Amino acid sequence: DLVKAVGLIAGAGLQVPNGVALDPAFSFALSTEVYPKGSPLAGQPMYPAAGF
């Protein structure tokens, strides 16, 4: 939903998004997945989450 949300604003190629307001009940709803070793950005949070 977050990706589709930022896609809704940045989809037309207009209005570059920045700054995200989250809710505490929605911060935990996000998965704490992290990029593997193979790809770059290794050891970096894939989502805002709440555990980091």
Added chain:
Amino acid sequence: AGLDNWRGLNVGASSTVSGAPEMSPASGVKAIVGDFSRVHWGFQRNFPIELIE
């Protein structure tokens, strides 16, 4: 942010490739790829901003 390089090519992004606001029904074209050295273009004369009163 729109990537500037893709597989060793030069990538530029603008609303001219389809001409969404300028054209009316839109061409529907999403991309134009090729040897852009084959197209010769230039300003034979380029004026600055002129104020007429």
